[PDB]
Symmetry: D2
Subunit: 726 residues, 4 copies
């Protein structure tokens, strides 16, 4: 009986904000949050309270502290089957990690369409606005291992398993609308180039090394997704604040057999928001689990991640109406040309119970479609269809990975497939082949139809010779990079410049830097000059003369490509550091905390040690963490309430907190005497945009702060930060 | 629809004799035969009727006859995910077979004790005669692979998984009471010697080769089990008609902590019965699945295999009371010295639904004991404890093999072990370690006790140095061989002689046969001379003068070691071939079938073609098989009714039928004109013992027949069979 | 000291007729036979004479007869690493058998073309009558497991691995010129149908059961290869006396890029010969290894299998 | 067995002994060594019992455990001296 008698070992089963309670398995945290998939997992959920400790064969263990030996200092005996079972299971706990997207964080939720999409697709899950479809989503990085850091610069995966009434549909996308290469045959070359180098296995979680930029310099098709990765897109604030995309053109097929080309989108209802590089990189050290943690705690708090599914739709007759090929996954479809039509909403509202069992074993694969969808000849998508089935044979130990509970369909599955390693299903069918008469030919094929029909591929015409040949329509590499560049704000552009400069600076062979610079000179000369200056490289007159690539279908920009050009701020679920002192002005804290609560913004109360401090009026303030324990990297803004500022004015950590927050462009608010900190960050007496200051935290102080928070960062501060030593 | 109109594709769900209906999975044949384990498999049992054919992901298939291709004569397309999933699962169906005992046949049943054994054991499944324990039993050969034949000369395995309330207990036995070797460390040597030789992988299912007899000749400890294998013990008639033994001394432990030495026995209630060598060998060609088929069909017929569990019990103070060591697994405990106490009955009453899922994947391990039992220092048993856990890691794919349905305890199992390939259980425990406070230390250890207690080892005293050394008390090799030899009937002795003779004639290196004959002369000179004579070897003067080994604790013999010395014949479930003609005397057949039914003996009606024949009075007689299709190898006796005997009297296959049955010592009955067949098998006009004959098949004729069938075979016929060319 | 004085434990390293000597591993039986593949396998061959017995880590073993225990009648100790390494390797000896054609017998050999076929194919191994290409050939049945009988009625496989100077070419044939079914999608259905039935795993090595004839009766495309299987083709006397076929039309491509359709054949130079059914069936019982034995003994005798 | 795929892990190049290794162990997944020994067991006469056990001794001897005295009952118990 080792639990504390006060029951404080057990987190409350009610929504609680980040840091308030220990985190728990989703079914213990939020037992009343249900969906059909979560319910269907009950057959395999294993409890523990009130149960005897046993071997796996059900035998009660008396002494789980000792091996069986001859004498209490004697040798361990081979007949200790209890020891050997327990050590054997431990010795085999690991399975191979995913070849790519090894690092991922996942949650349960549901999806519902806004209205029936029957006119354009017979997919059952999109047929009725009252049809709720359970989902399991895993977000990920790409390059690093399962034990690598979350806030690296990388593409992010966004994979959604829809447990539909007519089968599993996996929408396996990323946080940018394109991919680096055109044809799946090159995927191991590209991935090998970005992954740690094979002699020494360095670097982890980074493209900032020779082989990646070598490959990019020799394969200009890469440049478009490289632009995305070098922008602040490569370092999202949270999985809740990035976009998702299927990348490829797929098809919707309706009941009448009409095909429409579609590209899939996820819009984050919490808005788009990213870190800045120095912050992101430092955060991989102070909290390598920041995104995993932030996702988990948002869900425990009730700030459920929500996304709107949208479709770019293109009629068949319009296949050839763009300057780029629809089947080229290095090309995006600009929303100015083809708008995203809202389809439905996905809400992630429960964490898993066991990460290994639900997250690590989950298998997503874009070939898992359902009637009412179909593929295209996109030669990247075509090769993906082969890989995601093949890879599970080692990763999940054989062909029965669909019987792993997280992977099971919630709808019926019956066929003539048998055996394989780990077979769970016990088939009673007299027949394991068809056609058969001995079971009256059951289970039976189903003709295609408007609903509940069998899958039939769209009868697309194929005409050509058998060739290993790239379509000439795919041979244009620069105009999409340029459209992306021209769509970014000036501060975004500067961050792109710095991302290339920083990465190429880690490339040891200078000629590779030079070749990358030359490629940039084919995209935009301003970009290329700015990166060249940072690398001490001088463009040639030839380079200064390269003619830019054409506009994309007459577009000189599209603001939907920018994180920030069109305001979409949402403060709910964000967090503020509050820097306490040993005699806080309690009226300030009351005003601050209640203002934050009313807008769904969380607070963490920080000090120079753990335990408690006491306010002017005697209110006892619980300390969440120390200045060093919970650095400004982990919050969206910082508030210093008034009180005995002398307590902390000389504290190096307290000062550095504000300097780090300041450098990374975060809103800072200072009440009463906290304004003496103005000198630490070099603010003028009359103050500046992005620093909130007043005699107290009453009146408009909290509104001014929340306004800054809704705009995310203080971009206007950028020219100020270069000279500050932080 | 493909089934026949008349519904004759589906076997009746009621007990039916062998051959009357097509065989079926157990839950469809016998859906109301229930036990707790069978019921608990319902979560994984998968039906088929009235379901749509789907992928494993739940997507309905429209056309299960064709690949997706560009044009009806075009190439197959990579995007055909239906084809690839179906082919992938196929391509991965096989798992490694068991290292040994790969060939085996299994069934569900239950065990129930005859009385409470709590005076001698706290094992919960033996605490009360109303305690019903579900079992799953797998019988097997040893040497051959999963695709080898049943009726080889080999040891047979007899493995019983007891699903108890306090844990899985696996009693992993064989059909002889000893093993070939003394120390687990030599197991790979002996098994490599007996298995197919490494250069060419010959022979399958046979010890009749150089390397086995080389090892035997150099390791005299093997000779006792080799005597067993060379006897008719090596070639059982049925898994229903052989004994089972745990071989090793184990311990029972009671509530007071008192230990009693125990050896386990299974006594077959259908009695003991074996084939003869020529019959067994020929049967591996005519029906390599004979034992598997016979077991499945007995259960289908209601002839449930039944066995009494028996204990030989030796008080701990009696450890040194014998002239052999109780821990030596090459020594048996004669029942004349220590009787078998009959303790309970096991009944095998339902076949599996899917052979691969339930039988092939079942894992039995003698280290799976429950409180109330314990091990001993037997150095063969000691090493077993290591192997049966270790082997499953490759065989069943990882450390979660207890989650494979057939292996699951039906009692609770909870502990802190996590992950591993194909993890099914999703743990909700906040803690995955103990001691822990965060889950109040649950699941918790349990002190040992009289019932529902944790497992504690019997605190046996260990004194000695760390040595790789065989106990001197194991160093006697001939006295147990001799006791077994002296306990056999004279015809059992002749068959042992012929076993050795036949096997040694297949040893190519003559010095090996000579060296084996030398070992026989250390057991018994009569045996050694008779084998030497068959091999064209003459014993030396030195060999004639080898003193026989001593009696075993004064025992001149022990009749419990013979299959036949003491009558235990049971005819229920045996089978008789009835050889039809195109005008059978219907009155004969009425009386035969009636008398057979009365004793639960089955019949197969045989002819020269399939279809039907018509009796003298118009009865339509359906033909089960041809003479060549269902050879006398497959039946216990042959009856020839009267009728138009001219029809068959010139049929070579009919005459050979009777020659073969006669050679193999089977009862033959001939009524009225069927006595013309006497001449093909050389029966004197006056008749002979084992040929039943009369004017018609009246009442005395069947009693005669059935009395012979109760004595199994006509051993007195042996001197006559040397003359018959068959 | 264990071998006999007269050296009769060791087979003569020279061609001997079946039954004259015990059989032995190829490199010991016929150490003078060589080809380029066999030479290249030398880096992995391990001998045995005059070497100490060791663990897999190279530690010499003193006593390979006993486990380490506390007293000579005592319990076995967990620290016995020699026992656990040896038992662990034994525990994990088996690997999954082939889904189909699990039962099969194999030999090393060589191939040589009669003349250059450069006019119709640029395949290097067919370019020069002097070019000799090593092979490895495995013959098999189709239905039964690796431990099933040789002289069953079944299709036989005849698979040839050609180790050419421009890559491995595998010609993966059967002993009839067609197959039972038209489209690969149905392979698991047909193979499930002929394989032992799933409730009880019977029958081994035999198409003589309900599910096979159900599938055939419902799928007439199967009758052609069924005729062959039901003929004496389905019970060959020896792997040496059967034909082989690639079954499918493939292409030859010459240096000009001209494609020619091609079907592959193997002709047995020992001619064509089959058992009769009663003989074949009984023989599965009297010697289930008859074909594997006959192939190995032909090669030891110098009756080398030859195929055109 | 799981991490490296089976019991031939000593054949993965990095793991191989540079000294002789010979024994009667056979097969396993990804078996590299092709054994030519007529025998895969001992004792064997067919290869004159080779490879052979080696007595322990000063150098190049077989492995023999130190014959430490063991005295105690079969217990799952922490030595009091560890407390
Ligand atoms: C032909 C090779 C191939 C290529 C061209 C792609 N993938 Fe992929 N992908 C795999 C082969 C693969 C894989 C190796 O099979 C993975 C890793 C292990 C797994 O189960 O699937 C995988 C994982 C994987 C995951 C992680 C799923 C999870 O959370 O478990 C995501 C989100 C994507 N991919 C998304 C993409 C995108 C956006 C691509 C370009 C548009 C793309 N993949 C191309
Ligand atoms: C040290 C190794 C070792 C030793 C000395 C023994 N066994 Fe064993 N046995 C195994 C190692 C093994 C094994 C390799 O672990 C098997 C085959 C693979 C497996 O799953 O278990 C097995 C299976 C196995 C089976 C078949 C279980 C089934 O049908 O699935 C039986 C009946 C026995 N054993 C019985 C015995 C008996 C009576 C022994 C002598 C008293 C014996 N074993 C000694
Ligand atoms: C799409 C499934 C499939 C199809 C339709 C076929 N095969 Fe196959 N074959 C396999 C899938 C396979 C396999 C499952 O992959 C095997 C078993 C294990 C192995 O190594 O490959 C195999 C083995 C295998 C072997 C044994 C090779 C060996 O000794 O290792 C032969 C001789 C053939 N096949 C020949 C044929 C012929 C003549 C076919 C008809 C034209 C045929 N196969 C169709």
């Amino acid at each position: 009986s080792l639990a504390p008698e006060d029951g404080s070992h057990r987190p409350a089963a009610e929504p609680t904000p980040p840091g308030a309670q220990p985190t728990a398995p989703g079914s213990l945290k939020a037992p009343d949050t249900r969906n059909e998939k979560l319910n269907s997992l009950e057959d395999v959920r294993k409890g523990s309270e009130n149960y005897a400790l046993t071997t796996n064969q059900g035998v009660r263990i008396a002494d789980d502290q000792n091996s069986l030996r001859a004498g209490s200092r004697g040798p361990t005996l081979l007949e200790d089957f209890i020891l050997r079972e327990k050590i054997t299971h431990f010795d085999h706990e690991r399975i191979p990690e995913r070849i790519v997207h090894a690092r991922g964080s996942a949650a349960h939720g549901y999806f519902q369409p806004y209205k029936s999409l029957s006119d354009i697709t017979k997919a059952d899950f999109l047929s009725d606005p009252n049809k709720i479809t359970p989902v399991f989503v895993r977000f990920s990085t790409v390059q690093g291992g399962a034990g690598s850091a979350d806030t690296v610069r990388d593409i992010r995966g966004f994979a959604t398993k829809f447990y539909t009434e007519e089968g599993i549909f996996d929408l396996v996308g990323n946080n940018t609308p394109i991919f680096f290469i055109q044809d799946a045959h090159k995927f191991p070359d590209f991935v090998h180039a970005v992954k740690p180098e094979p002699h020494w296995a360095i670097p982890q979680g980074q493209s900032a090394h020779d082989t990646f930029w070598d490959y990019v310099s020799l394969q200009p098709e890469t440049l478009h997704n490289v632009m995305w990765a070098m922008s602040d897109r490569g370092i999202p604030r949270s999985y809740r604040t990035m976009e998702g995309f299927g990348a490829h053109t797929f098809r919707l097929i309706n009941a009448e057999g009409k095909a429409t080309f579609v590209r899939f989108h996820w819009k984050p209802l919490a808005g788009k928001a990213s870190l800045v590089w120095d912050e992101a990189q430092k955060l991989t050290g102070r909290d390598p689990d920041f995104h995993r943690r932030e996702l988990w705690e948002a869900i425990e708090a009730g700030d459920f991640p929500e996304y709107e599914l949208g479709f770019q739709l293109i009629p068949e007759e319009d296949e050839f109406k763009f300057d780029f090929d629809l089947l080229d996954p290095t090309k995006l479809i600009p929303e100015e040309l083809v708008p995203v039509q809202r389809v439905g909403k996905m809400v992630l509202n429960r964490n898993p119970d066991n990460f290994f069992a639900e997250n690590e074993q989950a298998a997503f694969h874009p070939g898992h479609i359902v009637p009412g969808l179909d593929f295209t000849n996109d030669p990247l998508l075509q090769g993906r269809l082969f890989s995601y089935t093949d890879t599970q044979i080692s990763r999940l130990g054989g062909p029965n990975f669909h019987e792993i509970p997280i992977n099971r369909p919630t709808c019926p599955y019956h066929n003539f497939q048998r055996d394989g390693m780990h077979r769970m299903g016990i088939d009673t069918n007299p027949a394991n082949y068809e056609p058969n008469s001995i079971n009256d030919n059951w289970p039976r094929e189903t003709p295609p139809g408007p609903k509940r029909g069998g899958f039939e591929s769209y009868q697309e015409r194929v005409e050509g010779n058998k060739v290993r040949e790239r379509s000439p329509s795919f041979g244009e590499y620069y105009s999409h990079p340029r459209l992306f560049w021209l769509s970014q704000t000036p501060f975004e552009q500067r961050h792109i410049v710095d991302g290339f400069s920083f990465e190429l600076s880690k490339v040891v062979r200078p000629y590779i830097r030079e070749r990358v610079v030359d490629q940039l000179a084919h995209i935009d000369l301003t970009l290329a000059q700015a990166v060249a200056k940072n690398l001490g490289i001088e463009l040639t007159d030839d380079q200064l003369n390269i003619t830019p690539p054409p506009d994309v279908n007459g577009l000189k920009k599209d603001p939907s490509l920018s994180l920030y050009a069109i305001p979409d701020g949402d403060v709910k679920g964000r967090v503020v550091a509050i820097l306490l002192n040993d005699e806080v002005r309690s009226a300030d804290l009351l005003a601050i905390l209640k203002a934050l609560k009313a807008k769904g913004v969380h607070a963490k109360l920080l000090y120079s040690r753990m335990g408690e401090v006491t306010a002017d009026d005697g209110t006892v303030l619980p300390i969440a963490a120390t200045f060093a324990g919970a650095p400004s990297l982990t919050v969206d803004a910082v508030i210093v309430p008034c009180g005995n500022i002398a307590d902390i004015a000389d504290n190096g950590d307290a000062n550095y907190y504000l300097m780090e927050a300041y450098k990374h462009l975060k809103p800072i608010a200072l009440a009463g005497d906290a304004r003496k900190f103005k000198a630490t960050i070099k603010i003028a007496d009359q103050g500046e945009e992005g620093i909130v200051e007043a005699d107290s935290a009453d009146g408009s102080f909290m509104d001014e702060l929340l306004t800054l928070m809704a705009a995310h960062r203080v971009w206007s501060r950028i020219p100020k930060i270069d000279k500050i030593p932080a």
